[PDB]
Subunit: 481 residues, 4 copies
């Protein structure tokens, strides 16, 4: 048994009735419990994430099967058997909190590893590529895909306008409009790092790496019809599924694989290996097994742990570095930037975001300082040998720059259509039919000029792809061939 | 033709490429356009409303048919033909911003009248009563109805626990579980002030008043099955429907009626006329036509106008005053309170919230001061005849207090069951079948003890109601009768 | 030895140099440590208190000498020898952080008692009365006294405009323009609760109470000349003094006394005993010793503990209640209100604000949720016996209301001038001279009409006081006499 | 004559009395005017600037005397006679908003030019160099100089610890401990850009440029004793002086001069021309007159204009670019960053901050959206020829990068002591005496080892400097010599 109390620790005598002039009269201002309780209610909500607002979290463990020390000095990957606690959030992308989990979208796949050398965030999606290759375009891309700013309804005429005029999107669209654009749930779903990262070993040698998560539960996707049926009865089916699996003891798991490429292979390829619109051939750069992640624990409070969770691709640990990918480069900034807004200057003290590794630095103050700070010395250099010092063992590498000037210029070898054509041709006939069906339903009402340009981009990827789409939309494209 | 610019008004040379070390190198910190564009994008979102997060807005006009000067000095009601501009937001209640408009819930019906004596907000719902009668219970009621704080899914076991232990909810539930708990859209929907207010005329005479909005399009509802069919294909059907009606010139309208009651009828009744769990008899207190509101204009920007709209029941105008309704009394506080959090201290300067009537006072400063203030004098009293002064013509009435002590006590004659029974009996057989169906689907999984208490509360309302529900749920209630 | 780390727990390899293109080139965006460090630095500051911005804090203990159980059931006062931890903040009033502590002003004297029945804040000042008697005037009073909104300099012509037109200020100004308007430091200074409160014993019997703190170090003040001498060399002399006393083991202390008055004495006094412009006679209501507060510990971190401290007069504990004082009644609302803005919705979880008594309630979420919440049940009533419940032993009293209407009306017996005259006459000749000197220096540059009305108010208090001031200012008052 | 109104535009009937239970009872919650008025009062304050919190603003005009088109394509400098409106804020640095203007500190000298090609901020100080040369050290430097985080008093032992271990500070300290560390006021004060910037002309040719403002009122400094004598009687003397000059029509003015250096002079020098701890010789790089700025208009409201003013060194206009100065590079980020926190995401819409040039871009939403946005198209590229487009005529230059790796490394030729010695020797004997006097008063109580290292740094600058200081401090340095 417990007393209901105010926030001052005073027990509440009556949690039913406001304080009033007799039994039916108007209310008094001197009702601290009423005002405190309403005022805190009135302040429950914080801004939702600007994208990936709808999602679900769980905790688990990552266990290494094969040490990666030949390629990275990352502590959490150093030894067979080594276990690292994770927190993972899965999500949709475009619509707000409360939106259905039956909509076409990439799905987020964000993993926070609580390592002995700091938190490592691998902030992935299910699909292995992206629509754009420079962060400068992200707000434009997002705005195009978001509900129209007048109507509050998503409009394919808007996002296809953007995408058609951004032909580097063609590969991504060739995946997103497969039925893998609507995963069945968060467990039966792929995971990808998307970007090339740099792995640096004990000798200082660097390789490029890509990360892949393969679900133990296999990949299951929904057709448009299957998605509609689920939407009719449950707008939160994936959130429900994840919680329920774990509550029943049916823990979902993913194997982690990497591809590795020498830096020197840039020069021989017909694409830029750090263009995130590109994959790497699994023939030429085979998947290498790293380990397994198992999610086995629901959070205790959805708001405090899942809603407040903060991931950033710049949360890198020794041995794992950013590549020069210009999309990634902007992410390094945007995540901690948004999070200071969404969660507060001290968001890294919120429990789910705290490292297991010790934190010692000269930062101070900010809204909601809860950490009981002490001491006179908040500056370095200082004369005190016991105060925190820099540690040169933990310097990052020094990537070689191939450019000579500060420029705003597209990467060389953009090669916008080739891989989209390869993906198309890798599709089974059924999968090619689903792709065309899903494209057609999406494009059939868009502006004719934008429609034609979409067809043209897909035709440039593969003639049979473009032509099939034209046939299905009833567009004759002979005069242009 | 126009230049794309920074916020400093500098034209942007390249909105495609970040600034980098050659065409494929990493990105530079000296890229003001990138950082400004991403930093603003990173800050687009503000907290959603704590309830009624999902909604849609329109502008229109209200026109008086019958002047109401005999009963209220309210300027906007003073002459036949008098037109007042309005802004209206409709909404659901419980789920977040992107949630479906096919869920069971009261619907919000919030009308802002831009009058010559200030803005008047009549913050209504479709249903004419409420679940509770004291604001002190609102955060509890809401928390019970909201998604579970661990799972992020609404749980009938939690809200029926609260409602069954809060038997004054029995009338509301008798309406909410009719098919009117899912209006077909926002146009074919009832509107109600819910609370009793006080109207005061120019002689200082007071009457109790209730407000009712009657849709020109008629009232139409959805069965559970009809709602699921809509949900399968559109999770923003009501938002879509409202925008489309107005865009095509098919403007939805409502007629405004009032009921009027003398304060001296309190002892005539077997309920408290200011208990918002109660309606008033239309036989004994007939509906009196006031005028008609037509919605004829969509907003230009959903975020700036609909999302940032701020209504409060305390935005009262001379001649229209609060009643003593303890639920209403807390609303007077909570709305401006939550708005200062959600929107900023200066939220009343956001265009949609601005009065048409002049504003002049001694308030100053606060985040985002955009109004070009001037002058030395920001205090009253002062020696300057030209500075703003109080105007005693605009004093509010002085309601008589019947109580002689500051108390926390339930009203007398709560009468929790009788009107629920009267409503039940007023239903057609088809409507009674829908009600029992809807209740049964909602109750069939809840804790048995809570299920029995639900049945008991409805049985106390009407024996046939309670027994039918018991029969439909398979609960034998013989031992209690 | 300790590593300097990022907030992610990664050790820092170089805390001297930004990451750049060669040893002298421009900076890269991929410098997480730079950006994290700068971004936190960029967010150190929170809004200063709207008043009392300049101040200093210490911890200590309060020990009861005489148990007060005959007059209040307050747990912390229930037994001889009972010790309660305190946190105290002293302050000036009008000027910002960084302003000198040699300015004329009331001094704040805010004491937070960490009791077994919750936190109790007694938010006092040194001087025992106030300028105004209704909270509606507070922002006007403050705006008049604050630096002019154009010039950013305080202007006596502004505040004397307000004060002269607010004659209830006359008693306060007769204290504030004694040399007690500049205490020598925070230790050699009076403390006062200012308002009448209600004390309620275990039989439910109520008395009016006033609180007084008497410094063990004596009361010492500064002339205008002595203040200027200090100001030349130290603008934080009182903060310095407090810290230095405690660091040296010279702990300052104050004895707590109360005056007690029966509620029934209202009716035969020639002033309202709950008018905070009035004191109570120490002959007719003698001071009764309660106990002693000793300050013996400096905070570990000024920002986290002193700057973020939050006191409210509405933080009352069982047995101690507000009176009807209309000034106090607004304070009940304003403090938690401003603190939610200044510090966050969860400001009551900042360590210095946390009670020692357990907190258990159904509030949730809000910015910077750091408390590791758990459980499914965040609403009451609920079916669970183990969840927090109200406790009727802790209900507040039910004060009798003497009025029968909701009114806006000044109190009866305002008696604006009599106690100002009594205070004047109680001064020594030297003290009278200082008063007239201090007033003259303040008034000599104000608008002539305002200057005359000041003189008139002081003359109404005492004809010698007013005539001496008129003579000292060179104002001929013959035509009025 | 005007009515006092609420923010809803309703005239206030009584601005003196709260609404209460009779004339002397407690206050009612239903008092919208009370609550709105207090709640706005409660939210007046915003965070002060993290440095340069104390300051004062004025408006004026900058007129070109000599067109600079041969060296920069900057539009505001393109023609003799061309006039540009400015806003200027002057400041101290370390202490908070209300702190005295008599303290030793650089003084801020921030100029916003409202040009036809966007706002250009030149965010200078009076002194022409800085303490440090890499932004990564700025939070350390500041934290050392700021009041101790326990005591809230500045401690020379803390900042001398930092500075002695940061010997690049030696030049700066040799200026700051001259009497120029305390300017007499803001009019009789130097101004400096401090950094090297890049000027780029219409042919794309780049020169390095340094900016200097020369007061029409001449330079006047205060001794420590003169500063104390002013501090005794006025803590806002420089704010007062500036307002009062302009109010009287005695408008202060500064002539703007530049020095210009070819990029190729790098190897001609024994320092780095982009090391902000260095000046350039006026013999070798003579001052060239550009024009004159006159301040002639005080602001209408100090909060709205001066307090909410936002300047950033990254507010550059075509033809003026950042240099590679690593201090400046961090500033490019930190200002807008801090401003988003201090003022809100939309701070660029606060009137003082708004450009005169048109702003058109695809940014949207954020707290306090007041600008009446409209339209469907908030993304680029898009198919609409009338929507804003990039303009290649306004591309920035492409500076050449000399380094071939991403490094963290000190510049070559840091040369920490030579220019400090040159400055020392340039001082008159009276100025040298003041310097030694000021240093000795500052150093006499610091840790002996720190004190000796200070002496050593100054001795390395000039033997006579160091020896005189050692003598004055009573430190025997024979035996290090
Ligand atoms: C320039 C490109 C991108 C930018 C600028 C960007 C920016 C952001 C921002 C600001 C957030 C909100 C973070 C928060 O509020 O905590 C977010 C969320 C997210 N983004 Fe990105 N994003 C980009 C591309 C991508 C890519 C390529 C992926 C995956 C590879 C991705 C995956 C995610 C995920 C999974 C989340 C949700 C994190 C969570 O669960 O809390 N984004 N993004
Ligand atoms: C209606 C009249 C008054 C109002 C509306 C008012 C309002 C406020 C507010 C809003 C603050 C800032 C609190 C914070 O941010 O934590 C404050 C501080 C303060 N007020 Fe008042 N006040 C009033 C009268 C008085 C009176 C009568 C006293 C003493 C009896 C007083 C003593 C103080 C003190 C000591 C502080 C500083 C507390 C601290 O150390 O943080 N005030 N006041
Ligand atoms: C007030 O909202 C609700 C009522 C009944 C069932 C579901 C809800 O979301
Ligand atoms: C950065 O300015 C300072 C230098 C020396 C002493 C005090 C200061 O605030
Ligand atoms: C050249 O060495 C020194 C000079 C002055 C003070 C201390 C030293 O170590
Ligand atoms: Cl640090
Ligand atoms: Cl707030
Ligand atoms: Cl006002
Ligand atoms: Cl609660
Ligand atoms: Cl921010
Ligand atoms: Cl843009
Ligand atoms: Na009429
Ligand atoms: Na006793």
């Amino acid at each position: 048994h417990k007393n209901l109390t105010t926030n001052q620790g005073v027990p509440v005598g009556d949690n039913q009735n406001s304080r009033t002039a007799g039994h039916r009269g108007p209310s008094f201002l001197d009702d601290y419990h009423l005002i405190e309780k309403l005022a805190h209610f009135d302040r429950e909500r914080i801004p939702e994430r600007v994208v990936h607002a709808r999602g679900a979290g769980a905790y688990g463990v990552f266990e290494v099967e094969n040490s990666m020390e030949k390629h990275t000095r990352a502590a959490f990957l150093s030894e067979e058997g080594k276990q690292t606690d994770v927190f993972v959030r899965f999500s949709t992308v475009i619509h707000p909190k409360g939106s259905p989990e039956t909509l076409r979208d990439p799905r987020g796949f964000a993993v926070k590893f609580y390592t002995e050398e700091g938190n490592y965030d691998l902030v992935g999606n299910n699909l292995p590529i992206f629509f754009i290759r420079d962060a400068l375009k992200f707000p434009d891309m997002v705005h195009s895909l978001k509900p129209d700013p007048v109507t509050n309804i998503q409009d394919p005429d808007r996002y296809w306008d953007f995408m058609t005029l951004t032909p580097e999107s063609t590969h991504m669209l060739t995946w997103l409009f497969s039925d893998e654009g609507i995963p069945a749930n968060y467990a039966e779903m792929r995971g990808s790092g998307v970007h090339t990262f740099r792995w640096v070993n004990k000798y200082g040698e660097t390789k490029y790496v890509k990360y892949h998560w393969r679900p133990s539960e296999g990949i299951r996707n929904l057709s448009m019809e299957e998605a509609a049926e689920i939407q009719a009865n449950d707008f939160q089916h994936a959130t429900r599924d994840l919680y329920d699996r774990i509550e029943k003891g049916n823990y979902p798991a993913w194997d982690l694989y990497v591809q590795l490429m020498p830096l020197s292979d840039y020069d021989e390829l017909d694409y830029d290996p750090c263009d995130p619109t590109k994959t790497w051939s699994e023939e030429d750069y085979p998947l290498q097994k790293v380990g397994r992640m198992t999610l086995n624990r629901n959070p205790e409070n959805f708001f405090a742990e899942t809603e407040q969770a903060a991931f950033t691709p710049s949360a890198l640990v020794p041995g794992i570095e950013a590549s020069e990918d210009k999309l990634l480069q902007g992410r390094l900034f945007s995540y901690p930037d948004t999070q200071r807004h969404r969660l507060g200057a001290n968001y890294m003290r919120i429990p789910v975001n705290c490292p297991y590794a010790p934190v010692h630095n000269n930062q101070q103050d900010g809204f909601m300082t809860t950490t009981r700070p002490s001491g006179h010395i908040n500056y370095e250099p200082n004369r005190y040998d016991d105060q925190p010092k820099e540690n040169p063992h933990y310097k990052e590498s020094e990537p070689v720059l191939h450019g000579d000037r500060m420029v705003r210029q597209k990467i060389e070898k953009p090669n916008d259509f080739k891989q989209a054509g390869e993906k198309y041709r890798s599709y089974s006939e059924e999968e090619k039919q689903a792709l065309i069906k899903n494209l057609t339903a999406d494009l059939k009402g868009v502006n004719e000029k934008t429609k034609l340009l979409a067809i043209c981009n897909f035709y440039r990827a593969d003639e049979d792809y473009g032509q099939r789409l034209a046939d299905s939309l009833g567009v004759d494209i002979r005069s242009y061939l």
